Design a protein around this ligand. Sequence first.
Ligand SMILES: CCCCCCCCCCCCC/C=C/[C@@H](O)[C@@H](N)COP(=O)(O)O
Length: 416
Amino acid sequence: EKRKAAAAILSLGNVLNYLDRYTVAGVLLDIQQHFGVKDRGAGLLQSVFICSFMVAAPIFGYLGDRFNRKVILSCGIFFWSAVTFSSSFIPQQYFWLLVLSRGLVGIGEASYSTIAPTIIGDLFTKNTRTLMLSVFYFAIPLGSGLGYITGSSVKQAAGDWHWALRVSPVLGMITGTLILILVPATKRSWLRDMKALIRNRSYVFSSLATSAVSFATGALGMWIPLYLHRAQVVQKAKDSLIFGAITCFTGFLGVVTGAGATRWCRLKTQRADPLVCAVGMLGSAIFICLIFVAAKSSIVGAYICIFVGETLLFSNWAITADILMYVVIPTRRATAVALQSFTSHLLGDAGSPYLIGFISDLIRQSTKDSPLWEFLSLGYALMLCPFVVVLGGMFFLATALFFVSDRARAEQQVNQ
Ligand SMILES: CCCCCCCCCCCCC/C=C/[C@@H](O)[C@@H](N)COP(=O)(O)O
């Protein structure tokens, strides 16, 4: 029971983690208006966070292995909660202070999101650990949707964008106390692995496909609420609320759709997983293309297109994990996962928000400023993402090309 209590507390911690991650994304319009910065700074607010998370994830993966885990995880949670609450008090004259606070929150969330799954895995046994990790990861879309809803509801209730960053820190400290109390006390080269992995074609192409998925996910999940609000302005705070509910349902249903497609395809071929990923990505790309055309005219069609595009886009998470598990022999599933996460962050979430902001800024600078042209510039900048989704689908098909050969090679090597 105590181990189940620890798993529940860490899952609630993950919910709070993603809520903190997307609270700013919920209320980006107010930050832009108050601080006066253009779209480039708004993109920077998440590019810096993701870069810090990128750089800090391997370090905390190493420190958890070579030091205590409960203390580090709790220090991380009282670190990012305190930093979020402090950053809520930043004056208007300072913006780089807010960006730096986003970076520090990124470091803390890196520590938590890198160490907590190891604790959850160590606590339980095979089937129990599988179920508990499934819950811990189902905490993700719920966390993101609750982050959007919390941001754009504390906005409307309190009346200041500041209070959007003030409600989550208290729960952060409380969950830190519960982690530091309820969780049972924790109990216990790369060169060759990297060369073998870069020689492994299926892993390389699946990693690039995951990078494209992360690019699309970061860029859209940040800029869609603001883009929909600009759509409402041109067409003449429910946008973020409905987007949060849509994100919750799509995160919960995309894995189910992927599992169904994998089940119905595996009876007919061995490359069911990458082919299913590729078809899902192509469908998501088409519907993400249609998001902008729909939102030009009516917003209900935009919400439906978001629903379908997220459902098809979010399906390729468990399937990507399965592909990586199959192609990579057991002795390298640690280095493979670490390098895949680093590469996905490097080519996706790290650069996508700032790149979309920069392209939007250039397009807007071309023409005289107006709300209609703000709409058009943001739409054209976000139009880059469907092309990235199509490219990722191409990379998934390239993975499918070598999937059989590399699965056979992995089985041959492990059977030795
Ligand atoms: C229009 C696009 C907007 C993008 C929305 C931004 C919010 C990002 C939310 C990220 C959703 C990722 C969903 C991942 C699910 C899996 O990791 C687990 N639920 C299942 O893994 P398992 O248990 O099977 O191992």
